[PDB]
Write a protein that binds this ligand. Structure first.
Ligand SMILES: Cc1cc(C)n(CCNC(=O)Nc2ccnn2-c2ccccc2)n1
Ligand SMILES: [Mg+2]
Ligand SMILES: [Zn+2]
Length: 313
């Protein structure tokens, strides 16, 4: 119990900030995650032996893909840590426990292909899960790893608390399907504006936790410009591979995924910021005022992409 994780001074301070980058040293990422669980949840939330075994099994079931990798998992978990630490009294013990684990597990066994590509390929997972194909697989993989011997980090919870936490994790992981984000934010927008939003209404909490998951999942657009710009290369490396694979199935990919149309990228980032990212962090800031730094950072980056187009960089 008396064993803490401590980070070097620069990390100890910068990790509290939304725009923190976890760095290129992979062997430090597990310690950073445990540090965040201990401060967000407590030193007692998990058996340290079981947590460490869970963390390393989760790492092993992420693939060596350009973007949807172990680094993304830890990055999305850090953004959730930042939201929880800035909204101390709004979330229950089970929710803080659940959401950090959901973020770490949210893209388990990702291959770097969209739900659309699985459907057009006719992948077995598309036959097994007709909607949110990859996300149902990510939750399936999470349950698998929790059921390995020595890996059940929730064993000390009651039967009902256990079922509650697995239901928080399931909903959280399904919400990372961007196809579900558009309707979810629209509903939250109306509820906030007509004043019907009620955080004691479980169906309302679910929607708010969903938007947090979208905000955390997209947080690469809220980093300082040099981090956002370099992460964009990894996300587009996956999109171009998928577009190559669409061409192999005899389907011309949308321009965003066509590597012959790299010129169109800056304008494609504009569309993504205006259609997805700005609306996402605007609604999140209305519902959770202390997440405003994510909206500010997103706006700064929209303006940096505007400069790329105007040939100023
Ligand atoms: C860095 C960093 C991290 C992330 C996630 N991006 C965004 C990369 N673009 C992207 O994901 N596009 C996308 C996927 C599905 N729909 N759309 C889409 C929606 C509206 C307009 C244009 C495109 N950059
Ligand atoms: Mg995903
Ligand atoms: Zn993700």
């Amino acid at each position: 119990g008396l064993m803490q994780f401590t980070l070097p001074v620069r990390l100890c301070k910068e990790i509290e900030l939304f725009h923190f980058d976890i760095g290129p040293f992979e062997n430090m990422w597990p310690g950073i995650f445990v540090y965040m669980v201990h401060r967000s949840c407590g030193t007692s939330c998990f058996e340290l032996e079981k947590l460490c075994r869970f963390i390393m099994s989760v790492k092993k079931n992420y693939r060596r893909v350009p973007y949807h990798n172990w680094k993304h998992a830890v990055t999305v978990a850090h953004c959730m840590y930042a939201i929880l630490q800035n909204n101390h009294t709004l979330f229950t013990d089970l929710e803080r426990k659940g959401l950090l684990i959901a973020c770490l597990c949210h893209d388990l066994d990702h291959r770097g292909f969209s739900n659309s590509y699985l459907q057009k390929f006719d992948h077995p997972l598309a036959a097994l899960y007709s909607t949110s194909t990859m996300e149902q697989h990510h939750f399936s993989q999470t349950v698998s790893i929790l059921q390995l011997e020595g890996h059940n980090i929730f064993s000390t919870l009651s039967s009902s608390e256990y079922e509650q936490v697995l239901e928080i994790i399931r909903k959280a992981i399904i919400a990372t399907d961007l196809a579900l984000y558009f309707g979810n934010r629209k509903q939250l927008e109306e509820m906030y504006q007509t004043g019907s939003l009620n955080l004691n209404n479980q169906s309302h909490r679910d929607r708010v936790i969903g938007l947090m998951m979208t905000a955390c999942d997209l947080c690469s657009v809220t980093k300082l410009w040099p981090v956002t710009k370099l992460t964009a290369n990894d996300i587009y490396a996956e999109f171009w591979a998928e577009g190559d694979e669409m061409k192999k199935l005899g389907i011309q990919p949308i321009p965003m995924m066509d590597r012959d149309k790299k010129d169109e990228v800056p304008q494609g980032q504009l569309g993504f910021y205006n259609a997805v990212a700005i609306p996402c962090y605007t609604t999140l800031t209305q519902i959770l005022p202390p997440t405003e730094p994510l909206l500010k950072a997103c706006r700064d980056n929209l303006s940096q992409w505007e400069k790329v187009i105007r040939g100023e960089e």
